[PDB]
Write a structure and sequence with these properties.
The structure is cut from a larger assembly and holds chains A, B, C, D and E.
Chain C lengths: L11 H9 L2 E4 L20 H4 L7 E4 H9 L13 H13 L11 H11 L8 H22 L8 E2 L5 H24 L2
Antiparallel strand pairs in C: 1-2
Chain D lengths: L3 H17 L8 H31 L11 H31 L1 H9 L7 H4 L2 H21 L29 E6 L14 E3 L2 E9 L4 E6 L3 E5 L4 H5 L3 E3 L1
Antiparallel strand pairs in D: 1-5, 1-6, 2-3, 3-4
Helix pairs in contact in D: 1-2, 1-3, 2-3
Chain E lengths: L20 H18 L19 E6 L5 E4 L2 E4 L5 E5 L4 H5 L3 E2 L2
Antiparallel strand pairs in E: 1-4, 1-5, 2-3
The chains are: A alpha/beta, B alpha+beta, C mainly alpha, D alpha+beta, E alpha+beta.
Bound molecules: zinc ion.
Zinc ion (ZN) binds next to loops of chain B.
Main location (chain D): nucleus
Subcellular location (chain D): Nucleus
Keywords (chain D): DNA replication, Nucleus
Chain lengths: 566, 187, 189, 242, 104
């Protein structure tokens, strides 16, 4: 309960008191790269600090080792540190070798020399940071006040409690303490929503902040639908609150329009054809099996029935027939039910600026992700790759400014190419039966084939994994086994291995709805790594992604088979 | 005539009020073209769709009839932004990004519609002369007359204006204006 | 000075500097009246800045006004000539007299661009209409300049009300053409 | 005088006249001294407040300078000093370039006995050192490179009797843009040069002898004119180069 | 910015061997002349400073080349590569001129 939802304001005031100055820079923000929510939140914070004239620095880091190396070089003149996208799960004081008594410069409690704020959404929390540390402070959103009721008592009372009742109680409370741990990890909220709450508390909300909040929230749709369904009504309310007025007389080159219009679960509808949108969709592919000939024939039959000529459905959206575009909603409503695709109809947010053209939030986040993925003796080889991944962050950052639209178009083209490549690899995976069904998990190792140099980036492998999980969820086979995806890099001679959680069908009822399936690959990987001298690298922010040498892959996986917890 | 005037007005407002960021691109292009004696204008269809979809829909279904109205709108705007008049009717050149249609897929379904296609030039003909302003006189009453023609497909009147014959009219070749026509072959 | 030409002509940024070295009117949102740290400036009179009261009209130099509007402590009032009525009057005056330039301030283009960029909220009229009117005026002034360029000689020219930016963008051509004509005339004497 | 605003106005007008003029204008000795003294004192002043604010902060973990009525004054001091330094820097470098262009002409002026123009007035002391050093360095370069292999008849870098004059002089008939301010301060009746014209404000008169004509300059109009016929008016502040 | 040019660190604009020996000598004395100008009566004004007018108090800059911590008047800048700064223009003019920072 360090900083509650209501308390978010006062912490800001502290940053205004210690850091703001016209002759020195004393605020540093460490933001997790390869993440969209953190990027949007950092953009909002940067604009806020720019308005109040507070000097700042933004440093994109990739892993925990980078953070540890950068913390030492950081001076004592920097009074404020902001860790965005990470830091909640691990013990920060032990990791950074922070001595509480060393940081007291304002003797009295202790005001302390430096303040570190943690803005993260990866549960479970670390009990040490929440309940036992004073230098480390976190922006909590209501997990502790409700979920961690007995944990606080156990932690504090075990700290203070340190003749047979003593032995009994200490054991049956360390049992509860270990019960808190040994649990998988999920995401339950979004950073951009919390920053928008801070904005509303201070009172600096506008259309740009709302657009950034929508962009941050939308990115969670593919992996965590429950959070999106929770946060959507508040976004709807805030959109209606900030509408300029009624009866807009004329469209002028300076109008901005944020509208709630009906959209569809289709891949880049307004920047490609209709046939392409239906072809390269995860949901349509899962529901119709387009990778073989039968799915393509079924799609052709559907398009024939709907009344759209096959020649017209392959034209660009701008140059598509006006009469067909006008009546698309009725045609969808009356025909989509026969083929099980009635779930593709939804409502979203569309933004328009003058005589330019309309863009939806989903297309924007796909363009940003595409810009993240592609843009612009083995240790150096990995270092160069990580440096390029850091470099792509500024390319994605620039695309959020209204002046740079050519970069957004480039991102759209890159997204189209990337999705085509993912589809091409997925059909090869599915046709040759490369997926092996073990008792505990399902294995997929890509050793040979073209364009394996695209899967050295974690985001592309997550794309392919999301394709495969979506394909498996709608399969009639009923199972919830986690999946393992491994990809080789010849230059480094290393496999990059990722563990992926199962997902329920998109349209399934809410009776099973709960806190989603927990990811248990981090604990298993740590358990196997500790016991054996395997040449593995666990250094990414996502604990489910590791880099293992080629020789160790086959034995290590065997150990995983007996590890359990999967 | 009560619809052509509004169409010309809509085109002139498109030319004079389109802006991206902080520059009227289509207003500046006209002035830059006039200086180097280029009497033409190039318009991208995406901008026209963005400005107003009704204007694009009007053009997309009746090109031969609508295009001359945009032609005269351009030269009305030019005489306003250039002169406080030897300016001929301007030319409209269009750019499109729609799907390309093969030559062998062109049939009776595509008549009177704007299309986009690609091919190989195999031959180019010589330049020929087409009349735009015709000075006309009658064989008997001998009075002056004029005719204005646009090349978007006319004949001399089959009557007399003020007995004269059936269709008595001759062309006064001096004081008449002509343009350049060429024929090309594709494959 | 020496690099990038700059020998005998001003750059647009230096013209902007000269323009921002000129006074403007503001409505302060703060009160810094002395009680019953101070500014102490060396190139501009600080009497108005020291004695400030909220919701009252004062005048300072332009760049201080921009610096204040960077924060939330100012609101610049646009000059009276930046109105649709006063611009339409000048357009008509421009149309009726085709042999003289209208009387506009010598910084109208630079001031208009700066105010549109920085203080967009302060205008009362819609900004797109004013932006169109500015272009309408500029085109006619360009036509008159093009007609007047024909009367170049070796003796002298008179450009009574031409603006600073218009003079700057035309100086290198005019000066060199008349210089060459003067050398040709002098040689024959 | 005794007005800090007029010093900045005079510096700006001197810079504007310097950039657009062909010749090497006289140096305003007193104005530069006053401005340099003012800058020297002002920098010390901002340094003093900065030190005073810093020292108290570390003593007893006191609060920083309270934000209201604190930051904006000092920020204005800094930016004002920055602008003034830029203006003086540009002025100095422009006049140094013009000094480079006319080295031999200035040397010939200094060497002439019956010349009212003297380098002690037209040139600053640092500019005198610059001129002397640059002339010697350039002479050494040309003597070592080319002039050593030449006949004694022609070994001089300044030859006014050769086929082409080797000493370049300022263009006295360059065409410039000018604005007619009128009297520098006022008292239009006091100025003898002012003469009224028909249904108009008083106008100056000048003569072009090569063309042999009389040109009238009305107050408030911008002219494109020869530089020689307007030297006296510019020297007396009646006209300003734009 | 004055300096001894080829002897000290140069901006790599010119190769040593293009210039003649007499030109190399001339450049050295000209640089010394610039140096003892900059220490004249105009100490406060940087005669080798930037020649574009100042019109933006606060600017965004990006680091081009990696470096260590550099002290500035009343503070410190940490030059981690691929990081962005929001700071006053006067502090970073020197670093932008020497190629360690981008943008303005
Ligand atoms: Zn007849």
């Amino acid at each position: 309960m360090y900083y509650g939802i209501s308390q978010f304001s006062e912490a800001y005031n502290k940053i205004l008191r210690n850091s703001s100055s016209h002759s020195s820079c004393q605020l540093v923000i460490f933001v997790s790269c390869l993440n969209i929510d953190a990027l949007c939140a950092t953009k909002m914070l940067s604009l806020l600090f720019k308005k109040q004239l507070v000097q700042s620095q933004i440093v994109p880091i990739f892993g925990y080792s980078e953070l540890r190396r950068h913390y030492s070089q950081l001076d004592d003149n920097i009074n404020s540190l902001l860790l965005v996208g990470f830091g909640g799960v691990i013990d920060l004081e032990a990791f950074l070798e922070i001595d509480p008594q060393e940081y007291v410069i304002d003797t009295d409690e202790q005001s302390f020399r430096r303040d570190i704020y943690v803005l993260d959404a990866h549960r479970p929390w670390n009990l040490d940071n929440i309940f036992g540390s004073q230098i480390i402070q976190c922006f909590d959103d209501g997990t502790v006040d409700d979920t961690l009721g007995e944990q606080k008592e156990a932690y504090y009372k075990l700290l203070e409690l340190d003749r047979k009742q003593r032995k009994k109680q200490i054991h049956e409370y360390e049992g509860v303490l270990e019960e808190y741990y040994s649990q998988g990890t999920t995401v339950v909220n979004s950073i951009s929503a919390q920053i928008y709450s801070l904005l509303s508390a201070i009172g600096e909300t506008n259309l740009s902040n709302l657009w950034l909040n929508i962009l941050g929230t939308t990115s969670l749709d593919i992996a965590y639908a429950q959070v999106y369904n929770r946060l959507y009504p508040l976004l709807q309310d805030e959109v209606k609150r900030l509408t300029p007025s009624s009866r807009n007389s004329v469209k002028t080159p300076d109008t901005l329009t944020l509208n709630i219009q009906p959209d569809y679960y289709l891949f880049l509808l307004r920047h490609s054809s209709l046939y392409d949108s239906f072809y390269y969709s995860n949901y349509v592919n899962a529901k119709l099996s387009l990778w073989n000939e039968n799915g393509k024939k079924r799609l052709h039959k559907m398009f024939a029935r709907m009344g759209i000529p096959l020649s017209t459905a392959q034209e660009t959206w701008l140059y598509m027939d006006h009469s067909i575009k006008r009546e698309l909603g009725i045609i969808f409503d009356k025909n989509l039910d026969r083929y099980g695709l009635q779930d593709i109809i939804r409502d979203g947010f569309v933004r328009t600026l003058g005589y330019r053209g309309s863009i939806s939030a989903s297309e924007f986040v796909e363009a940003l992700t595409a810009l993240l993925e592609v843009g612009n003796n083995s240790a150096q080889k990995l270092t160069n790759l990580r440096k390029r991944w850091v470099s792509n962050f500024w390319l994605s950052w620039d695309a959020l400014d209204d002046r740079k639209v050519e970069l957004l178009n480039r991102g759209i083209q890159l997204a189209q190419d990337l999705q085509r490549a993912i589809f091409n690899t997925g059909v090869a995976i599915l046709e040759k039966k490369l997926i092996k069904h073990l008792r505990i998990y399902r294995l997929c190792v890509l050793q040979d084939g073209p364009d394996l140099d695209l899967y050295r980036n974690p985001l592309t492998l997550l794309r392919l994994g999301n394709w495969l999980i979506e394909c498996c969820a709608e399969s009639e086979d009923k199972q919830l086994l986690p999946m393992v995806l491994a990809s080789i890099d010849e230059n480094t001679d290393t496999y990059l291995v990722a563990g992926l959680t199962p997902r329920y069908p998109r349209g399934l009822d809410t009776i099973h709805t709960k806190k989603p399936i927990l990811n248990n690959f981090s604990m298993a990987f740590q358990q196997i790594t500790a016991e054996t001298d395997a040449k593995v690298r666990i250094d990414n922010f996502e604990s489910s992604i590791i880099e293992i040498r080629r020789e160790d892959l086959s034995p290590f996986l065997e150990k995983l088979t007996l590890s359990g917890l999967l | 005539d009560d619809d052509n005037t509004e169409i010309i007005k809509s085109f002139k407002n498109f030319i004079l009020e389109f802006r991206l960021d902080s520059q009227f691109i289509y207003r500046d292009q006209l002035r830059n073209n006039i200086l180097v004696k280029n009497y033409s204008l190039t318009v991208n269809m995406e901008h026209l769709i963005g400005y107003n979809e009704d204007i694009y829909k009007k053009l997309s279904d009746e090109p031969s009839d609508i295009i001359p109205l945009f032609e005269t709108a351009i030269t009305q705007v030019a005489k306003r932004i250039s002169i406080l008049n030897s300016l001929p009717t301007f030319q409209l050149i269009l750019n499109s990004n729609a799907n390309q249609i093969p030559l062998r897929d062109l049939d009776s379904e595509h008549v009177s519609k704007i299309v986009r296609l690609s091919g190989i030039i195999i031959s180019t003909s010589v330049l020929s002369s087409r009349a735009t302003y015709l000075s006309i006189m009658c064989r008997n009453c001998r009075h002056t007359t004029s005719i204005t023609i646009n090349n978007f497909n006319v004949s001399l009147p089959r009557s007399c204006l003020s007995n004269c014959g059936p269709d008595p009219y001759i062309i006064i070749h001096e004081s008449s204006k002509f343009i350049d026509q060429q024929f090309l072959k594709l494959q | 000075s020496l690099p990038a030409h700059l020998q005998q002509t001003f750059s647009p940024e230096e013209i902007q500097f000269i323009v921002e070295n000129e006074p403007i009117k503001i409505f302060p949102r703060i009160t810094t009246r002395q009680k019953i740290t101070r500014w102490q400036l060396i190139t501009t009179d600080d009497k108005a800045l020291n004695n400030m009261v909220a919701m009252r009209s004062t005048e300072v130099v332009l760049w201080i006004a921009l610096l204040l509007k960077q924060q939330s402590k100012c609101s610049i009032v646009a000059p009276q000539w930046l109105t649709t009525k006063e611009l339409d009057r000048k357009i008509q005056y421009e149309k009726t007299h085709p042999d003289r330039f209208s009387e506009l301030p010598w910084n109208w283009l630079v001031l208009a661009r700066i105010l549109f960029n920085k203080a967009k909220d302060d205008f009362h009229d819609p900004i797109h209409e004013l932006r169109g009117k500015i272009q309408d005026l500029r085109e006619i002034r360009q036509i008159k300049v093009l007609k007047g360029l024909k009367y170049l000689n070796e003796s002298h020219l008179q450009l009574d009300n031409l603006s600073l930016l218009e003079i700057n963008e035309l100086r290198p051509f005019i000066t060199e053409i008349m210089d060459k004509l003067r050398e040709i005339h002098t040689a024959s004497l | 005088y005794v007005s800090p605003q007029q010093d900045f106005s005079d510096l700006m007008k001197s810079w504007k006249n310097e950039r657009c003029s062909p010749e090497l204008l006289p140096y305003p000795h007193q104005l530069m001294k006053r401005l340099l003294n003012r800058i020297s004192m002002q920098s010390q002043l901002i340094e003093n407040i900065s030190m005073g604010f810093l020292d108290m902060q570390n003593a007893s973990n006191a609060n920083p300078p309270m934000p209201n009525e604190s930051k904006l004054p000092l920020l204005c001091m800094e930016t004002e000093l920055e602008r003034l330094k830029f203006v003086i820097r540009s002025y100095i470098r422009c006049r140094l370039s013009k000094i480079d262009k006319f080295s031999l002409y200035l040397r010939q002026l200094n060497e002439d006995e019956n010349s009212l123009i003297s380098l002690t007035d037209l040139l600053s002391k640092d500019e005198i050192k610059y001129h002397d050093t640059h002339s010697l360095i350039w002479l050494k370069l040309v003597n070592d490179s080319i002039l050593k292999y030449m006949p004694e008849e022609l070994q001089a870098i300044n030859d006014t009797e050769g086929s082409v004059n080797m000493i370049d002089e300022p263009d006295w008939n360059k065409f410039v843009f000018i604005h007619v301010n009128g009297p520098p301060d006022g008292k239009w009746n006091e100025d003898p040069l002012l003469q009224e014209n028909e249904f108009g404000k008083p106008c100056y008169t000048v003569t072009i002898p090569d063309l042999k004509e009389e040109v009238e300059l009305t107050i408030g109009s911008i002219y494109v004119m020869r530089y020689e016929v307007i030297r006296d008016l510019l020297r007396d502040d009646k006209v300003a180069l734009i | 910015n004055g300096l001894d040019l080829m002897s000290s660190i140069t901006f790599s604009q010119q190769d040593t061997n293009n210039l003649s020996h007499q030109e190399q000598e001339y450049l050295k004395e000209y640089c010394d002349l610039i140096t003892d100008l900059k220490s004249g009566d105009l100490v406060d004004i940087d005669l080798s400073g930037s020649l574009v007018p100042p019109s933006d108090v606060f600017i965004d800059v990006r680091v081009l080349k990696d470096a260590g911590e550099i002290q500035t008047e009343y503070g410190v800048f940490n030059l981690i590569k691929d990081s962005q700064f929001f700071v006053r223009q006067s502090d970073v003019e020197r670093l932008i001129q020497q190629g360690y920072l981008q943008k303005i």
